[PDB]
């Protein structure tokens, strides 16, 4: 950095916290002073679907304590698919995080009615990116939570899911831009097997641009960005 001591120590500290797997990035700063922001756990850049879920309006955000997490392929078209899972989760009593590729108006509006009037505590967020890397990252998210990805390819109806088929986390926190999950229930050995799979494909990566995107997936699963 041409004899800039501040830049050198910031990177030494960052490499410290992120770890060897962790990725350090450079962005335009808010102010005159340089800053370093390190996030550990599974963070990704998708916001809350509606502002009605906000149970911390002094933080401007939603926080849910010990939640189940549901991962679904395609669109959530109706509550008509959702019902037995909704009955089961409500009866168990835990809060819930809904991951899917989209949520339809009937589904979103019904979720808002249930949260608002206190029946079930539920947050809903959109899946990250597009195509195959969205599918891959959804499996990585399931490996972290210790859950099952519900999809048509495996032949899993949303209507035939049970509470054994949902992963879990210690805490989840969500903003208008960003989603972050703190400390999975997923088994560490399974996480490392899946990390090893992802890492092996880094060694095969012809596109350097996509190799970086593979580096982020290893970093989110293990270490920090």
């Amino acid at each position: 950095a041409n004899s800039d001591e501040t830049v050198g120590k910031l990177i030494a500290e960052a490499m410290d916290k992120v770890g060897k797997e962790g990725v350090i990035t450079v962005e335009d700063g808010t102010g005159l002073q340089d800053e370093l922001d390190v996030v550990e756990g599974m963070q990704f850049d998708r916001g809350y679907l509606s502002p009605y879920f906000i149970n911390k309006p002094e933080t401007g955000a939603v926080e849910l304590e010990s939640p189940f997490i549901l991962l679904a392929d395609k669109k959530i078209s109706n509550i008509r698919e959702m019902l037995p899972v909704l009955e089961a989760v409500a009866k168990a009593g835990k809060p819930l995080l809904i991951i899917a590729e989209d949520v339809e108006g009937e589904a979103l509006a019904t979720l808002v009615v249930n949260t608002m009037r206190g029946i079930v505590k539920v947050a809903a967020v959109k899946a990250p990116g597009f195509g195959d890397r969205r599918k891959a990252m959804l499996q990585d998210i399931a490996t972290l939570t210790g859950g099952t990805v519900i999809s048509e390819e495996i032949g899993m109806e949303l209507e035939k899911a049970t509470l054994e088929d949902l992963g879990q986390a210690k805490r989840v926190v969500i903003n208008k831009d960003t989603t972050t999950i703190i400390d999975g229930v997923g088994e560490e050995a399974a996480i490392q097997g899946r990390v090893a799979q992802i890492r092996q494909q880094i060694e095969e990566a012809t596109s350097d641009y996509d190799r970086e995107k593979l580096q982020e997936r290893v970093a989110k699963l293990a270490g920090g960005v």
């Binding site: 509550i79 909704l86 019904t110 249930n114 029946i119 079930v120």
Partner: protein, 97 residues
């Protein structure tokens, strides 16, 4: 005086629109479930099909019923409140079991 069903005709109140707490648990939003269950208000005489002696209708006032929400089934205010008018055959059923 309200107004009275003809031969083969029945008048009923539709029980609910949406059985709102699904399973007894989940409070459903906008689902459009106009209830298939009705309850009998008036019964029009008998059926005068087939020329000879007139047959009494097998439905009666006080009955809880299920009907088809079909083309034949009409709806209008008794006093200020919507109730439904149809044939005995557009009705499917009356409280068994």
């Amino acid at each position: 005086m309200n107004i009275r069903p003809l031969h083969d005709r029945v008048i009923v109140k539709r029980k609910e629109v949406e059985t709102k707490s699904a399973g007894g648990i989940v409070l459903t939003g906008s689902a459009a479930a106009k209830s298939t269950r009705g309850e009998v208000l008036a019964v029009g005489n008998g059926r005068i099909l087939e020329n000879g002696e007139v047959k009494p209708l097998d439905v009666k006032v006080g009955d809880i019923v299920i009907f088809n929400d079909g083309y034949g089934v009409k709806s209008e205010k008794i006093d200020n409140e919507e109730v439904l008018i149809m044939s005995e055959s557009d009705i499917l059923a009356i409280v068994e079991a």
